[PDB]
Amino acid sequence: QRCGEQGSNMECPNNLCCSQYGYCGMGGDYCGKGCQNGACWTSKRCGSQAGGATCTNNQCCSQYGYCGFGAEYCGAGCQGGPCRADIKCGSQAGGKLCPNNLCCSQWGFCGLGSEFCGGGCQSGACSTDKPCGKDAGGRVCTNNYCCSKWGSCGIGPGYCGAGCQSGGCDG
Amino acid sequence: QRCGEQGSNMECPNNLCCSQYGYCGMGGDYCGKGCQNGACWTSKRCGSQAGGATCTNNQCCSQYGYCGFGAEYCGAGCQGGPCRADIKCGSQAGGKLCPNNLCCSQWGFCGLGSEFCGGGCQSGACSTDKPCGKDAGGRVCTNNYCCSKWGSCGIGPGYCGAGCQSGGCDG
């Protein structure tokens, strides 16, 4: 029930702003000074202008390194987020990974849904559950996902903990 | 630190899936059965096909009523979310409001950033802090925002509680 630093980076629903205290709302108390994610009054910096930073709440990183929505942000020059132009990836784009766990479809584009996450999915939030570990040719997970004891790709205590063969294994 | 029903509908960062227990991760434990928001394996239904439902995590509602990202969802037919086509609103579009608290720019388009939220902003997450209440011609907040005792538009205990002149005042 806490957002931002005090909530493990959770994000408020419907673009609600996370105040500097970790609570969700709308208004200057939440959206003004110290806003953490959501519809903050001052846009967070992103991409090239902000060391390759990603925007929260799936916001588009505009060509000038500002987070937002609308033509100016998702339109021409958009450096990340749900950009108006197809985002390439996969063997098709030198092993690039989609930002924010988006699936690299079989064709080399970034999205979320059966078309990207299903059959052929290359990296990200694939729903294919392709096997890893000693159990699977000693193959590794993409996105540095933790290969669990049971030979599964995921993120979490179950995956990243006790039994993790490879991946971002807890240490 | 809880997501979904047990977290007041908080959402995980970077499209992490909220398992049926309110925890954030990646994998079948979180993304499979019972997934709540984030990159769920089965897409949540939206718009027309799902009683005007909005997609979480700012996802695009495709023409067939499915939540996602990429051409198929944000492209042609997109019924909500950060749609590839400008979303109209404001006096320009019969008082329509942007979905998910997006600002209705001075021109009648939906976004988030200074261009929409700043000067001229019509409804949503305006950063203009235009005054309400008895303190302001007895004007009301848009989006049924709570007009606080001090004459401010917001959402939260401070706004919606004790002193609320109009808006979605707590009852």
From Swiss-Prot, chains A, B:
Keywords in alphabetical order: Chitin-binding, Disulfide bond, Lectin, Pyrrolidone carboxylic acid, Repeat, Signal
Disulfide bonds: C3-C18, C12-C24, C17-C31, C35-C40, C46-C61, C55-C67, C60-C74, C78-C83, C89-C104, C98-C110, C103-C117, C121-C126, C132-C147, C141-C153, C146-C160, C164-C169
Residues that coordinate or bind substrate: 10-12, 62-73, 114-115
Domain of life assignment: Eukaryota
GO molecular function: carbohydrate binding; chitin binding
Domain called Chitin-binding type-1: residue spans: 2-42, 43-85, 86-128, 129-171
Misc. comment: The 4 sites proposed for binding to carbohydrates (N-acetyl-D-glucosamine) of receptor molecules are on the surface of the agglutinin molecule.
Protein's job: N-acetyl-D-glucosamine / N-acetyl-D-neuraminic acid binding lectin.
Subunit structure: Homodimer, u-shaped.
Identification of the protein by name: Agglutinin isolectin 1
Covered range of the whole protein: 28 to 197 of 212
